[PDB]
């Protein structure tokens, strides 16, 4: 005789799984009107672009090294020319760190540039190099940018090239990753990457994969010897099947992916390091990362990739 099991309580317990569902449902509904509102404004703002006026330093050379030797002692945008053939290109030269002579190659610092770009833009370069100081005429400070694959592959092949990779917390901490063998092949070879001499505080992610994994797990995040793939041209360590495995999906960074990664300097720029699977556009590690330092699910606040021809130590 179970006439007591009568869940009348359910008829007056269900209003719970209602008022609640009713709450967030209406929440989202409105949030949408806010998101819809905010984007329309940005549409406006873009009726006009940002503009820089970067007068050129008289001095020039093959890269930033030569330039400093010619007296390039300040840090700002210069114009180089690795070869008589290639027409002279602009670039930010770091003349204040090690000895200076750092040909900036990549630079992430405040999320002002979609790196979630295709194969083409990566191959040619994008973003803003330097931008104007204040009252100073020249543009003495950089901005996020990719120097572009050919221009880069073109520089490494010019002779022994060392590579420095710096990064910063959202707390302030900072670490570096120095390699002495950076040499990117040409487009013909899928810009195959290859480094050779680590030394530093960030952790050798590039040729040692992530320090958090092990066994085959580790051996599958080593970027060395990896082709460069973009969301529009896969060159990872995958296999043609259900793209649930494809290292660079939409608006994802272009990089030398291999069974994905240990590091991704051109990843997406999440604000304030900490990001979650429920925030990632596809529930993947979109961010700018260095597992061997900050681990996964933590996007850096700043990260760059400078270059300078190593000369006998």
């Amino acid at each position: 005789k179970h006439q007591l099991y009568i869940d009348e309580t359910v008829n007056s317990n269900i209003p719970t799984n209602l008022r609640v569902l009713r709450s967030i449902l209406e929440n989202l509904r409105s949030k949408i009107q806010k998101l819809e509102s905010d984007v329309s404004a940005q549409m406006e703002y873009c009726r006009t672009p940002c503009t820089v006026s970067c007068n050129i330093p008289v001095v020039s050379g093959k890269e930033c090294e030569e330039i400093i030797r010619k007296g390039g002692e300040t840090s700002e945008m210069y114009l180089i020319q690795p070869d008589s053939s290639v027409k002279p290109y602009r670039v930010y030269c770091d003349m204040n760190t090690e000895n200076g002579g750092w040909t900036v190659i990549q630079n992430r610092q405040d999320g002002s540039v979609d790196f979630g770009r295709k194969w083409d833009p990566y191959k040619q370069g994008f973003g803003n190099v330097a931008t104007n100081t204040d009252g100073k005429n020249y543009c003495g400070l950089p901005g996020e940018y990719w120097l572009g694959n050919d221009k880069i592959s073109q520089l490494t092949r010019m002779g022994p090239t060392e590579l420095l990779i710096e990064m910063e917390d959202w707390k302030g901490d900072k670490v570096k990753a120095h390699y002495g063998g950076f040499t990117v092949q040409n487009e013909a070879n899928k810009y195959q990457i290859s480094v050779n001499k680590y030394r530093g505080t960030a952790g050798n992610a590039l040729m040692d994969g992530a320090s958090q994994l092990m066994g085959e797990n580790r051996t599958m995040t080593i970027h060395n010897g990896m082709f460069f793939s973009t969301y529009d041209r896969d060159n990872d360590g995958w296999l043609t099947s259900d793209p649930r495995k494809q290292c660079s999906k939409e608006d994802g960074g272009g990089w030398w992916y291999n069974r994905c990664h240990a590091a991704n300097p051109n990843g997406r720029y999440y604000w304030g390091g900490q990001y979650t699977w429920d925030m990632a556009k596809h529930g993947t590690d979109d961010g700018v990362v260095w597992m061997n330092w900050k681990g996964s699910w933590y996007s850096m606040r700043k990260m760059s990739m400078k270059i300078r021809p190593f000369f006998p130590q």
């Binding site: 008829n11 940002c50 330093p57 114009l79 008589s84 979609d114």
Partner: protein
Amino acid sequence: KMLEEIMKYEASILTHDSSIRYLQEIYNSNNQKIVNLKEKVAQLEAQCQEPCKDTVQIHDITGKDCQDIANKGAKQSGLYFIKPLKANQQFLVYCEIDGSGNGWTVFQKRLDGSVDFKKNWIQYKEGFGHLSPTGTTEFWLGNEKIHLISTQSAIPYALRVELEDWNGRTSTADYAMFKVGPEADKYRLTYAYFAGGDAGDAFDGFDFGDDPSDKFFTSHNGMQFSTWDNDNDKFEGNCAEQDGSGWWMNKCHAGHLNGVYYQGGTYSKASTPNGYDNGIIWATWKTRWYSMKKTTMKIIPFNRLTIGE
């Protein structure tokens, strides 16, 4: 409450079924605004893909020198690449062109202070400063360059020298047969003769009245260029390290443009703890204690303008 509390339960599930149905009505209508919002953003992202517009542009018209360019069909003053006959790689220069066909290849200009002129030997050899396409930037093109142009294919060069006070009055001073030599020769300046310039001829020297050997001790013709880290002047020690620059010194000067930019233009010996003619001076025009507001050294193949217009 046998069926008294029961006839109500079979009546509330409707009240609920209504709420249920309604919520679905919103959940759906939400996925709508969402699917749309998503395209609205793509619409946006496509807009933000081009970097800031960089107002400074370069013209691909290339030549042996600004003249060879203006000749080539150029029509506007700006930045231009050039490569002298003896050059092993071109380089950026600013060219001043007038509605007559003049390729005034410029090599040094001052007008605000922006660039401290106390640079080393190498900095004068390679060049320093910046080149605005409009020329509102100070800069030393660099001796090596200056030389290279001045000695290409036995081509005859001249040097106009535009100066400006702080009361808007200006004066030129040309030097026919302008030619700058090898680093080997310490870039030594050399012009054959003074020409049409109402600014005077400070290059021939000046009798400042301090001493009667001043005129042959302040003249600059055939003099070697000298910085603080490289002395080749005709004075015990270096005038450069003293005045604070790089120039063709000889027991100093009677007219040097790399002088420390004195705002206002007027100065005294109270300036430096010792005092000098270290200011931008051109005595033949105005006092050694007067510092020009603007200054421009430009060359042009002598074959061009003879007197003015």
